Design a protein around this ligand. Sequence first.
Ligand SMILES: C[C@@H](c1cccc2c(-c3ccc(CS(C)(=O)=O)c(F)c3)c(C(=O)O)[nH]c12)N1C[C@]2(C[C@H](CN)C2)OC1=O
Ligand SMILES: [Zn+2]
Ligand SMILES: [Zn+2]
Length: 234
Amino acid sequence: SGEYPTVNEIPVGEVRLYQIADGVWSHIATQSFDGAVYPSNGLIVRDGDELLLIDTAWGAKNTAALLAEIEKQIGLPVTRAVSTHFHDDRVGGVDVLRAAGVATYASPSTRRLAEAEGNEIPTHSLEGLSSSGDAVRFGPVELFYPGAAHSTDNLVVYVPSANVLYGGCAVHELSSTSAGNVADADLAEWPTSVERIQKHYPEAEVVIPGHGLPGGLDLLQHTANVVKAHKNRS
Ligand SMILES: C[C@@H](c1cccc2c(-c3ccc(CS(C)(=O)=O)c(F)c3)c(C(=O)O)[nH]c12)N1C[C@]2(C[C@H](CN)C2)OC1=O
Ligand SMILES: [Zn+2]
Ligand SMILES: [Zn+2]
């Protein structure tokens, strides 16, 4: 009823939307992985009379439910989607999107990693993002490659009309106590990549993590802190 929805508030297979700003929503879904349930976020951005989707809802059935929720709550067609790295919480559901008429995009790095790991593969490659600090425009957003962090391919998304920074899984929520799933991470470079985000988007008003609650710019510094401490404990 208005609060940001949480993991215990969304059954696996349902999707919620949350209004972030004019023409900007997050999507929230839950999924089981190795015997535990986790929430995950994505983004929806109005693109005239169409919508741009950032990230799947972590699975085929979740992503079909996402499309149905968009049709119910917004009623504009999703025409393009961008996946911000190669893990299943970002690309799982790309086949559902593609069969629904959505054009799917990711960096060449993401596409190669998804293919090699057996995850679903976005159709179109996003050039111009291969060096840290690179940025390109994509409809109503800017895509930014900050460097290796949660994964070597992770991208961040900025919505300039609303000063919304979607960090994806390179950014953690304020309540986080560790750096999440670090299987494919570069803990040594992650603080430098977060610093690049901070320097590139100093006017961000809302920061959305890949999992958990949005907040303000403090999510970036908190992420650097938890990552350094993870490496320090380990
Ligand atoms: C699909 C994704 C994945 C699965 C399950 C959990 C997570 C988390 C996560 C996020 C938050 C917290 C709370 S917290 C900050 O307080 O710790 C947490 F506990 C876990 C994340 C994320 O951190 O982005 N991603 C997760 N996968 C799988 C894998 C590829 C496989 C290797 N082949 C392993 O590396 C992934 O990332
Ligand atoms: Zn990941
Ligand atoms: Zn993640």
